[PDB]
């Protein structure tokens, strides 16, 4: 990771799934990045500006990916009461 002379070693720092906090590996051909665009007035959807969510393959495989995504959305306010904390 960190060398004694301050400077970084570590060839690349990996992405962690925004739902589990678990690391996504390099040959994780199942994992995903969802880009949800920043909206404006009159809708219009601001070009080249978005909220990104990484999902590990594992969650997707399991099935509780959609739910996780929903949860993520309803903490950045992209959805308004779809997911409830108390189930």
């Amino acid at each position: 990771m960190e060398n004694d002379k301050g400077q970084l070693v570590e060839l690349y720092v990996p992405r962690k799934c925004s739902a589990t906090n678990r690391i996504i590996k390099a040959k994780d051909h199942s994992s995903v990045q969802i880009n949800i665009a920043q909206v404006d007035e009159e809708g219009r959807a601001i070009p080249g500006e978005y909220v990104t969510y990484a999902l590990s393959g594992y969650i997707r495989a399991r099935g509780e990916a959609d739910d996780s995504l929903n949860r993520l959305a309803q903490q950045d306010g992209l959805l308004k009461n779809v997911w409830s904390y108390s189930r």
């Binding site: 739902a19 906090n21 399991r62 509780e64």
Partner: protein, 129 residues
């Protein structure tokens, strides 16, 4: 028979983590268990945990951030003799940089580093990384 409660708790936590859950429901709850949890919290392996009062044994709800990759009790609480801690560390922990061996000393329940600092040893409990 529920021979060990702490062990059960730890196993439950592990199960929760592996399946990706963000919260556990530990069911018998003790002093020792609480202490163990606190150590983890201090080291940042766990979020906020809370103790429900049943008026009988207890029940703990634990929030998991996702950083904790294994708990684990080492069961027959072996009497570890200061110079012996190192061997245990070598065995149980995945590296020499991080991870903690939790051991109950007369100075209280702590991780091995803390014990070393304080210069105390006792019976082993578990490990976290």
């Amino acid at each position: 028979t529920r021979t060990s409660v702490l062990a059960d708790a730890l196993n439950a936590i592990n199960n929760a983590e592996k399946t990706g859950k963000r919260q556990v429901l530990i069911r018998p709850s003790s002093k020792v268990i609480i202490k163990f949890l606190q150590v983890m919290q201090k080291h940042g392996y766990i979020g906020e945990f809370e103790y429900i009062d049943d008026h009988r044994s207890g029940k703990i709800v634990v929030q998991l951030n996702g950083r904790l990759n294994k708990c684990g009790v080492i069961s027959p609480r072996f009497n570890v003799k200061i110079a012996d801690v190192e061997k245990w560390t070598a065995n149980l922990l995945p590296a020499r940089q991080f991870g903690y061996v939790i051991l109950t000393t007369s100075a209280g329940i702590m991780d091995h580093e803390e014990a070393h600092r304080k210069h105390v040893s006792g019976k082993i409990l578990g490990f976290v990384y």
